[PDB]
Enzyme design. Sequence first.
Site, short mmCIF file in Angstrom:
data_model
loop_
_atom_site.label_atom_id
_atom_site.label_comp_id
_atom_site.label_asym_id
_atom_site.label_seq_id
_atom_site.Cartn_x
_atom_site.Cartn_y
_atom_site.Cartn_z
CE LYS A 17 50.75 33.61 30.58
NZ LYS A 17 50.68 32.58 31.63
CE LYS A 36 47.37 24.97 21.94
NZ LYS A 36 46.58 25.91 21.07
CB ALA A 87 46.22 22.76 9.42
CG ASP A 130 42.38 35.74 18.95
OD1 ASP A 130 42.32 36.58 18.02
OD2 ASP A 130 43.32 35.71 19.76
CG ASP A 148 39.97 30.43 18.57
OD1 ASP A 148 39.41 29.55 17.91
OD2 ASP A 148 39.37 31.16 19.39
C1 LIG Z 1 56.78 25.64 7.82
N1 LIG Z 1 55.61 24.96 8.36
C2 LIG Z 1 54.78 25.67 9.30
O1 LIG Z 1 55.04 26.78 9.68
C3 LIG Z 1 53.59 24.91 9.84
C4 LIG Z 1 53.00 25.34 11.16
C5 LIG Z 1 51.97 24.67 11.63
C6 LIG Z 1 51.40 23.49 10.85
N2 LIG Z 1 50.30 22.72 11.34
C7 LIG Z 1 49.49 22.94 12.49
N3 LIG Z 1 48.45 22.09 12.73
C8 LIG Z 1 47.66 22.25 13.79
C9 LIG Z 1 47.90 23.28 14.65
C10 LIG Z 1 47.30 23.80 15.86
C11 LIG Z 1 47.96 24.91 16.32
C12 LIG Z 1 47.63 25.78 17.52
O2 LIG Z 1 47.71 25.39 18.63
N4 LIG Z 1 47.19 27.14 17.24
C13 LIG Z 1 46.87 28.02 18.37
C14 LIG Z 1 47.03 27.69 15.91
N5 LIG Z 1 48.98 25.13 15.38
C15 LIG Z 1 50.01 26.20 15.44
C16 LIG Z 1 51.40 25.61 15.70
C17 LIG Z 1 52.34 26.73 15.25
C18 LIG Z 1 51.62 27.48 14.09
C19 LIG Z 1 50.13 27.05 14.17
C20 LIG Z 1 48.96 24.14 14.37
N6 LIG Z 1 49.73 23.96 13.33
C21 LIG Z 1 51.93 23.10 9.71
C22 LIG Z 1 53.12 23.87 9.16
#
Ligand SMILES: CNC(=O)c1ccc(Nc2ncc3cc(C(=O)N(C)C)n(C4CCCC4)c3n2)cc1
EC number: 2.7.11.1
Length: 262
Positions: A17, A36, A87, A130, A148
């Site tokens: 959002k 972010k 991650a 969350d 979260d």
């Molecule tokens: C096929 N690869 C994948 O789907 C993949 C998706 C994310 C990562 N790394 C990753 N690393 C740090 C993050 C922080 C956020 C976030 O603001 N969330 C509220 C949780 N997120 C989100 C982004 C979208 C999904 C989680 C993060 N994501 C690696 C691989």
Amino acid sequence: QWALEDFEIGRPLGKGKFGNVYLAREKQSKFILALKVLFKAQLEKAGVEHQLRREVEIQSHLRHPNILRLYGYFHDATRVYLILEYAPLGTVYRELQKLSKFDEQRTATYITELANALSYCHSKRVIHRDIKPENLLLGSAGELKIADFGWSVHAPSSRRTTLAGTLDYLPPEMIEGRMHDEKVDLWSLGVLCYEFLVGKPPFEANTYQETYKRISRVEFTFPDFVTEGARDLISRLLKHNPSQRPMLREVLEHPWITANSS
Ligand SMILES: CNC(=O)c1ccc(Nc2ncc3cc(C(=O)N(C)C)n(C4CCCC4)c3n2)cc1
């Protein structure tokens, strides 16, 4: 210190959002991180610009192996930038999509990590994370990270919206509009343990309205393969009365957890 010019930008990992999360790399070190980006217009429209300031300060002081780290932040005229730990293995939600459901060893190991992270949070008066699986990420060692902070952001592969996933995890006291305390995190742990073992959250219904009733009346049942130890832990976490929910140290010592966790 930081500015956007310090980073190379790659693809969006997901969108929410309030903005997007990009794969990024700090130019000098070539360190991979998650940038972010939150749009000030969206934060203003929703009236959450003051909540963001408080959570940035909180997150800046949370240091735990199972909590996603905030490295720093900055802003420009239209955007706020959160420099987050990346991650590499994606969300647990995606792992669950891939495997359909987790075995007891994986489930108990994940619950142990989250219980440790939540105990640390509570020790700092940080409550109600969350912890729906879309907000739980997998580090390079497969270790769980609570992520979260800064609101939900979904990857293109996701099939559950932010409102639906968050509702699936809300405790009765917040649906019934009552005071709540840190026991909301124990409720969430029970919903997660069930979703891990079953592949679906326990109060899922066709409509949000029916889901409200199911949560408030704690109407859930177990598939036949859920073992008795798992049933006992989940049943204790999903008590309507928050005072009846176990302490996190009691989760960590639960015989099903100790028998199955790595
Ligand atoms: C096929 N690869 C994948 O789907 C993949 C998706 C994310 C990562 N790394 C990753 N690393 C740090 C993050 C922080 C956020 C976030 O603001 N969330 C509220 C949780 N997120 C989100 C982004 C979208 C999904 C989680 C993060 N994501 C690696 C691989």
